[PDB]
Design a protein around this ligand. Structure first.
Ligand SMILES: CCCCCCCC/C=C\CCCCCCCC(=O)OC[C@H](O)CO
Ligand SMILES: CCCCCCCC/C=C\CCCCCCCC(=O)OC[C@H](O)CO
Ligand SMILES: CCCCCCCC/C=C\CCCCCCCC(=O)OC[C@H](O)CO
Ligand SMILES: CCCCCCCC/C=C\CCCCCCCC(=O)OC[C@H](O)CO
Ligand SMILES: CCCCCCCC/C=C\CCCCCCCC(=O)OC[C@H](O)CO
Ligand SMILES: CCCCCCCC/C=C\CCCCCCCC(=O)OC[C@H](O)CO
Ligand SMILES: CCCCCCCC/C=C\CCCCCCCC(=O)OC[C@H](O)CO
Ligand SMILES: CCCCCCCC/C=C\CCCCCCCC(=O)OC[C@H](O)CO
Ligand SMILES: CCCCCCCC/C=C\CCCCCCCC(=O)OC[C@H](O)CO
Ligand SMILES: CCCCCCCC/C=C\CCCCCCCC(=O)OC[C@H](O)CO
Ligand SMILES: CCCCCCCC/C=C\CCCCCCCC(=O)OC[C@H](O)CO
Lengths: 305, 305
């Protein structure tokens, strides 16, 4: 029984991750619909999370990390990957239906397995190449039938697969190396990442968008409602990422990506219902085949030498 | 020397393979321009090779093979792969510029390594997945900028990668298992394949297209000139494939496919010049990156366990 309640405790982290992430995705897309500034919005989301984390430390509500030069050095690559994936995915969100962005990002486990096997010196059974056929075909069919398709929206989402996988792998290194450091709990690892990532993205966001005026592109929406929407999705952006690092603490980076693909089925189903996204038969079939393929790919990589 | 004279003789076979195949590709596309019946034309090409081989046997110009029940059984899957790839590529030739057909088929060595590793039980180094990025990106960019792109022309060419790789691997097994059968020289192996393949394709060609009228769609071409064009490309279709089986007899199925990609660079350059194919900057760049990635894939696969 205790082993089962532990898995139920870990599974509950996954639920919270999915639950916060769905609330975030809906509110984030609604923010972008009336305030199309992906660079500044994504930077604000990191800043809100950075501020939230410092207050927890200041108030003594969260253990303060034993910060060292060795730890900051070991978090640069996790923060580089987080910043790039965050800015790329927000750009994708701003250009296409977010259901499509998540279809592209559903192939994350393949990038995760390749990067992890590269680092671990593992080899791939040839049958994993066979499972690439439905993955590549499914994404290609999904993109070719996606009504909101743009090349930049597709490529930024694909780039985020690479950035987040490096983040997850390098973050997993650090969490294992500092496993004895009782103060570096999972939330503190992500807390330091969102602080570093904020200053990493801030100069770029100011360069390409400056200071956008707080004006809704949807007529009739007050500035108070727009500001509230920015803060709301910024809060849940941080909460889902923070809880996800508890999940990352408990699984391998590849299992974390498999957990992300399961998350994305939920986000895709939820977002197309909330936004009444038009979906043709071929688009349904392409996206479903792509996601079946990445699961079969993970199944093949796991069950073969 | 004795190994060197052999590699020079083999190198001369590769030259005839490339030379005959270029003459074939030009004439074949000119015939399809006048007479757009890929099923019947591809079936005729197998039959002319069948007839050419039987005349060599009847006139005592080539040793007759001792055909046995076991040999025929061993040549069914080679003939299935040959028939399918032949009909698929000819269909592709008739729908798009043949330079684009060969760009898609330039990824053949990837299909070759996978199928070869599937049978041999080898595993793939993680770096080979990284080389897939320029391959997928280059083929996608090429397809997205190809003036003559059709989905059918792209898919039939991609399917031919699977069929021909199946043909090469199963043919290589047959040639190895029957190496001690002195009458089964490389040309006799392909001769039997083109006979079986002809009768495999013949019923489908009649069902698909019936008996096409021998009338040129291009003005000023008599029936005799159209007939002569059909025989001409049929002769060099057989000559390039027959000489290619001497190459296959002396190299691995993967090395054969790598030799095919080198051939396709020559065919692409020559066909765009002969046909004055419009090629934009992005299209040349995509096609070059796709073929560069295939050679990098082959390098990573060969240079890493
Ligand atoms: C222009 C970049 C601003 C970066 C500052 C982020 C501070 C986050 C808090 C509120 C955002 C203001 C709405
Ligand atoms: C293990 C998962 C297996 C099957 C679920 C496949 C997921 C089914 C989700 C299909 C995606 C979809 O609904 O398509 C919407 C479209 O992408 C809007 O952009
Ligand atoms: C295993 C590879 C999976 C590939 C998925 C194929 C789906 C094809 C669906 C419609 C094509 C015809 C529509 C017109
Ligand atoms: C293992 C990881 C797999 C992930 C890799 C998946 C493979 C994606 C390949 C090609 C998609 C890009 C081609 C896009 C398909 C056609 C869509 C399109 O370009 O449509 C025209 C557009 O509407 C006009 O702007
Ligand atoms: C897994 C299923 C995912 C559904 C998740 C939330 C339901 C959201 C539906 C919102 C109802 C539409 C409101 C307009
Ligand atoms: C319709 C396109 C033109 C069709 C061209 C005819 C194709 C079949 C001819 C001969 C194969 C029969 C093999 C006979 C081998 C006999 C060898 C022997 O003499 O013993
Ligand atoms: C061996 C390595 C070769 C590298 C360069 C090969 C790249 C040359 C490929 C030809 C590019 C090209 O001409 O594209 C034509 C276009 O596809 C019209 O269909
Ligand atoms: C790694 C292979 C990636 C291939 C990238 C090809 C470069 C295309 C760049 C810009 C096109 C924009 C049109 C102007
Ligand atoms: C080993 C790897 C083998 C190579 C794997 C290659 C994967 C390429 C993926 C998709 C190509 C097709 C998608 C791009 C098609 C966009 C062009 C397009 O659809 O344009 C509309 C057309 O003009 C009107 O029919
Ligand atoms: C009418 C038919 C005319 C027949 C023309 C074929 C001539 C030589 C075949 C070349 C193949 C040479 C390779 C064999 C190996 C040496
Ligand atoms: C290696 C490149 C091979 C190119 C061969 C091209 C031959 C003739 C084209 C002359 C143009 C005819 C008009």
């Amino acid at each position: 029984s205790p082993t089962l309640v532990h898995t139920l405790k870990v599974g509950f982290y996954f639920f919270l991750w999915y639950f916060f992430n769905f609330i975030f995705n809906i509110a984030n897309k609604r923010t972008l619909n009336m305030w199309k500034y992906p660079w500044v919005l994504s930077t604000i989301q990191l800043g809100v999370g950075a501020l939230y984390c410092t207050f927890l430390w200041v108030l003594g509500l969260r253990t303060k990390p034993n910060v060292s030069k060795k730890l900051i050095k070991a978090l640069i690559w996790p923060s580089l990957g987080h910043t790039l994936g965050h800015a790329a995915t927000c750009m994708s969100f701003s250009l296409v239906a977010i259901s499509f962005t998540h279809v592209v990002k559903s192939a994350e486990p393949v990038f995760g397995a390749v990067g992890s096997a590269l680092v671990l010196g593992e080899f791939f059974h040839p049958l994993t190449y066979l499972t690439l056929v439905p993955i590549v075909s499914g994404v290609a069919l999904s993109a070719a039938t996606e009504l909101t398709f743009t090349w930049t929206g597709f490529i930024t989402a694909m780039i985020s697969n690479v950035a987040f996988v490096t983040r997850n792998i390098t973050s997993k290194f650090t969490m294992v190396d500092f496993k004895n450091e009782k103060t570096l709990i999972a939330q503190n690892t992500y807390a330091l990442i969102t602080i570093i990532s904020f200053f990493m993205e801030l100069p770029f966001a100011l360069l390409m968008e400056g200071f956008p005026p707080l004006v809704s592109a949807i007529a009739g929406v007050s500035k108070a409602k727009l500001f509230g929407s920015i803060m709301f999705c910024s809060l849940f952006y941080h909460l889902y990422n923070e809880v996800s690092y508890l999940c990352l603490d408990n699984v391998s980076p590849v299992s974390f990506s498999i957990g992300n693909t399961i998350k994305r089925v939920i986000i895709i189903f939820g977002s197309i219902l909330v936004f009444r996204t038009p979906v043709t038969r071929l688009n349904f079939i392409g996206s479903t085949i792509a996601i079946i393929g990445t699961m079969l790919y993970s199944l093949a990589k796991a069950k073969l030498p």
